[PDB]
Structure 1
Amino acid sequence: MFENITAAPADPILGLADLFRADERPGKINLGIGVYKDETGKTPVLTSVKKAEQYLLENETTKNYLGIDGIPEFGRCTQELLFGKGSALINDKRARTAQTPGGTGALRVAADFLAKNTSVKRVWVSNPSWPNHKSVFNSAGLEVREYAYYDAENHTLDFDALINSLNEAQAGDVVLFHGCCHNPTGIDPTLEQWQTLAQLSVEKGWLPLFDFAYQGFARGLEEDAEGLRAFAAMHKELIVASSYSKNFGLYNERVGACTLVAADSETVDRAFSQMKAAIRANYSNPPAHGASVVATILSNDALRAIWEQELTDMRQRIQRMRQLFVNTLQEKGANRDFSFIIKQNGMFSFSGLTKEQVLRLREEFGVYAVASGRVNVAGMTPDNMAPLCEAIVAVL
C-alpha cells in the first residue's frame, strides 16, 4: 500500500536545521531558528514557569481528562489577555475559548470547524507569511489566496497593494491577519491602518481570522492587542488563534487557544458545540501541563509579575539586537542601509539578501538563514555580531 508513496518535500525552515547540525565549522551562526535565544545562545525555561511547575507537582491529585475545551481558568485568562479586562465581548459573553495544542493546533481546529460548518472555502493569507499557514488550511480542504503586503524596495507595508488585493475577496471569505510581529517581515500595520482595515472588513463582509503568536514581543501585552481590539469592537464575528509558545517559552508543551466570537451568547454557544465536535474527532481533549502552567502564572500576581518582567527582558533583548545589528553593519562599512531593521517588530525580518547571497553566506561563512533571507534577530548576540556583520558585508 505504501510501496509507491512519494517522499514529502523538505520544510524550508526545518530542513535548514539538519544542514546546520552537520556543518562542522568553527564559528557558525544559525539565524534560521524561529525560536527565542538569550545572550548565551540558549532557550531556557522561564523561572516563573519553573515555579509554576513546582506548584503543580505538589498540588496535582489526578491526571483525569480535561473537557474538550480544556481548563476554564486558562480560557477566561486568555480572553482577558486578548480583548481587555473589561471588554464587552467578555461581559456579553459572546466569546468561547478552547485550549488547543499550540497555535498551529488552534488554526487547524478553526480550519476544520469552518470547512465543515460554514460556506467558506477561500482563505486569504499575506505574501509572504509563515509557510505552514497554507498547509494547515489546505489540509482542511480550504483554498488559499494571497493578498499583497510587503514592499521589496522600501521594505515596508504596501498598504495600497494590500487594499487592492483584498478587493477581489468576497463576502464570506476568511481573511487572515497576523496580530503583531508579522512573520517573516516584522512589518505591522499602524493603529490607523488597522482601523481602516477593520472598516473595510465590515463593509466587504470578510470573516477575520487573527493569528496571534507573539503577544508581548512588539511593544507590550496590551499595545500589541490594539489591532485585534479594533476589529473586535467592529465585528459581530471573528476567530483568533493564539500561542503561548514564545511569550512563555513553552514551545514543546503545545499550549495555545482558539477563540470564537459570535453576535451573541446563544449563537456563540451553538457554534462552539460544533467546534468541540471538531476537536473530539482530532485529539479528543488538550494536554494539561503547559496550559496548567499558564493558568496558574496568570492567576497569581507574584508569579504573573515575574513572568511579565521576563517577557519585557526578552522583548528588550530583541530590540537591542536589531539596533546593534544596524550599527555594526553601518560600522563595518558597506554601501547599503539597514535602517528598516529598527522599524520592524519581533524576532524576524527580511535581511534583504538575495537567494545567492544567503547561499554564499551559508557555504562560505557558515552563516545560516532561511532561503527567503528571513533572519532571526534573537539568534544574534553581542559576541557573534561582529563576525556575522563581517560575513554579510563580504557578500554585498
Structure 2
Amino acid sequence: MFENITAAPAADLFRADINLGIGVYKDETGKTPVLTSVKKAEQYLLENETTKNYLGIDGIPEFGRCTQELLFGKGSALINDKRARTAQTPGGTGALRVAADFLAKNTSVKRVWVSNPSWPNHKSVFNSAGLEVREYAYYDAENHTLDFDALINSLNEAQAGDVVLFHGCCHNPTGIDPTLEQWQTLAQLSVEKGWLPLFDFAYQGFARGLEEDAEGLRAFAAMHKELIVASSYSKNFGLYNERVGACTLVAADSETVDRAFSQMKAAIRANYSNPPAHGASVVATILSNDALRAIWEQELTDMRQRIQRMRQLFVNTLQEKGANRDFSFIIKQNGMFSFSGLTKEQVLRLREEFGVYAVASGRVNVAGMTPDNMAPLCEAIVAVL
C-alpha cells in the first residue's frame, strides 16, 4: 500500500551551526519562557482540577466567552444578540481547519482568497478540506507598504460566495496592516461583493494593543451578518505547544448561528472529537481573573514593546553600520515579522557566509534580535547589500 508514496516536499542547518527564521517570540536573553501568568494558572489547575473528564465538543464555556469579548469587545451587539458561537480548537491552525471543513461540507464555498504573501500553511489547510486557494495582491515592494489599490483590483476577481481571508493584525510575513480607514473600505466592499470574511487572528496584542488590534475585525463585524474568526493564543500567551485557539462563527441571528454551529461541532467531532483542556483552561483561568489578567496583559505589553524596541534598534544599527538605504519601513510595521528587503540570494549568502538565518523571502523575526546580537547581525546584513 505504501511502497509508491511520494515523499512530502522537504533549523537543522542552524543547529549544525543567529536565528531570525524562528517562529516564536524570544526575550532579551534569547529564551521563550513560560509566561509567569501561565505558570500561576498552571499551579492553580494542578491544585484544583479533580477530573480530566472530556470537555464538550466546543470546549470550555468560559474560554468561549472570554474569546468573544477579546474579539468583539465587551458590550458588543454581536454578543448581546447571541450571534456568535465559539469552539475552542487545537491552535489557530486547528481553528482554520475546522472552518475549512465546516465550509466545505455545509456551504457552497469552493474558493478561499489569501494575500500574496501569507503564512505558507494557509494553502495546505484549505486545500486539505477540498477548497481552492486564490491569491490577492498585497505588498508594494518599493514603498514597503500595503499595495492597496492593487489588493482591491485583485479582489474584484473574487465571486459572491467566495471566502476572503484577512489577517486581523500583524500580517504574516509583512507586518503591514490596513489602516482603520482601509479596513472600513474593505468591510464595505466585502458586503457589496458578497464575500464571506474569514479573519485569521494569531497576534492580537502584538501590533498596538488588544483593543486597537481588533479594530479591523470589529469594522467588518459591524457591517456583516456573517463571518468566521480563527484565533490563536499560541504567541500572546506563549502557549505554542498546548494548542490553544478558537473558531468563532457569526451569523445573522441566534437561530441561524446555533443551527450552523451544530455542523461546526459535527466537523470537530469527526476530526479530534473535543479539544485539549490544559492550554485553554490556562487562558480561561487568566482572562476571567482580574489579578492574573493584569499580570498577563502586562507580560503581553512587555513583548509588544520589546519588539518595537528591536525594530527601532535594528533601523538605528543598520544606519550606524553603514547601510545608506531607508529601513524606516521597519519601525512602522507590526508584530514579530517584516520583510527585510533582501533577495533570496542575499538570504542564502547571510546563512552561508555569516550564519545569520532568515527565510528566503527575506522575512525576519524581529523578536530573534537582541541588544547583544544586533551589531553582528547588522554588520552581516550590510556586508550582503
Question: Shift in Å at residue 243 of structure 1?
Answer: 0.1
Q: Which runs of 5+ in 1 are unaligned?
A: 11-16, 24-28
- Match of residue 9 from structure 2: 9
Cα deviations across residues 102-141 of structure 1 (Å, max 9, x unaligned)? Answer: 0000000000000000000010000000000000000000
Question: Shift in Å at residue 334 of structure 1?
Answer: 2.2
Question: Shift in Å at residue 34 of structure 1?
Answer: 1.2
Distance 1:34 1:220 in 2: 21
Within-5 A mapping of 1:1-396 = 1-10=1-10, 17-23=11-17, 29-396=18-385
Distance 2:349 2:325 in 1: 18
Distance 1:19 1:179 in 2: 33
Cα deviations across residues 209-267 of structure 1 (Å, max 9, x unaligned)? Answer: 00000000000000000000000010000000000000000000000000000000001
Q: Which runs of 5+ in 2 are unaligned?
A: none
Cα deviations across residues 365-387 of structure 1 (Å, max 9, x unaligned)? Answer: 00000011010000000000000
| Structure 2 SS opposite 1:246 | coil
| Structure 1 SS opposite 2:263 | helix
Distance 2:344 2:200 in 1: 28
| Structure 2 SS opposite 1:310 | helix
- Match of residue 14 from structure 1: none
Cα deviations across residues 29-76 of structure 1 (Å, max 9, x unaligned)? Answer: 000001000000000000001000000001000000000000000000
Distance 1:355 1:181 in 2: 23
Distance 1:146 1:322 in 2: 28
Distance 1:271 1:80 in 2: 21
| Structure 2 SS opposite 1:145 | strand
Distance 2:286 2:218 in 1: 24
Distance 1:311 1:244 in 2: 11
Question: Shift in Å at residue 343 of structure 1?
Answer: 1.1
Q: TM-score, normalised by structure 2?
A: 1.00
Q: TM-score, normalised by structure 1?
A: 0.97
Distance 1:371 1:154 in 2: 20
Question: Shift in Å at residue 18 of structure 1?
Answer: 1.1
Distance 1:356 1:241 in 2: 34
| Structure 2 SS opposite 1:368 | coil
Distance 1:248 1:219 in 2: 16
Distance 2:13 2:363 in 1: 17
Distance 1:39 1:128 in 2: 29
Cα deviations across residues 134-187 of structure 1 (Å, max 9, x unaligned)? Answer: 000000000000000001111100110000000010100000000000000000
Distance 1:334 1:328 in 2: 9
| Structure 2 SS opposite 1:125 | strand
Distance 1:62 1:289 in 2: 12
Distance 1:49 1:30 in 2: 26
Distance 1:336 1:140 in 2: 44
Distance 2:142 2:23 in 1: 25
Distance 1:203 1:174 in 2: 14
| Structure 1 SS opposite 2:8 | coil
| Structure 2 SS opposite 1:176 | strand
Distance 2:13 2:226 in 1: 44
Question: Shift in Å at residue 336 of structure 1?
Answer: 1.4
Question: Shift in Å at residue 19 of structure 1?
Answer: 1.2
Distance 1:123 1:307 in 2: 34
Distance 2:33 2:286 in 1: 17
Aligned-pair RMSD on alpha carbons?
0.5
Distance 2:284 2:45 in 1: 11
Question: Shift in Å at residue 4 of structure 1?
Answer: 1.1
Question: Shift in Å at residue 335 of structure 1?
Answer: 2.3
| Structure 1 SS opposite 2:384 | coil
Distance 1:183 1:159 in 2: 16
